[PDB]
Write a protein that binds this DNA or RNA. Sequence first.
RNA 1: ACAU
DNA 2: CGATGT
Length: 135
Amino acid sequence: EEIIWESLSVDVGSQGNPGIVEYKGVDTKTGEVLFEREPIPIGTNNMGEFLAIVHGLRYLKERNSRKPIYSDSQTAIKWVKDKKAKSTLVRNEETALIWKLVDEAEEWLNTHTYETPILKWQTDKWGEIKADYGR
RNA sequence: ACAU
DNA sequence: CGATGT
Ligand SMILES: [K+]
Ligand SMILES: [Mg+2]
Ligand SMILES: [Mg+2]
């Protein structure tokens, strides 16, 4: 119904899927960029969306912030809820980095607690998420 | 089908 | 058009 403006919004950007993956988190109210991940040479859109949420969780926890996180990714929200990223991406030498980060993000989820609500950004009603890359 |  | 996901 109503955007919760006091929130963090995250999104992935890619060149190819699979392809080069990056992500960022922004203040939903102002668009201020709060974190950005260095591009990862090969990953999937959903792995990036998943890493972006988990990074958001870690970012907010470190700062003692109870703000919710918005993501537009049904998939990544579910993967975080499950603490398991069910990616189809082949595990080989060229995908090792993204899979290391995904594995480490799962590991963080399995060893830490959080109350952060992870909310679906309703793109159909509200337009593009504020963290979008514009491509 | 829906979400990317 | 192609790909990633539930
Ligand atoms: K984009
Ligand atoms: Mg997205
Ligand atoms: Mg986007």
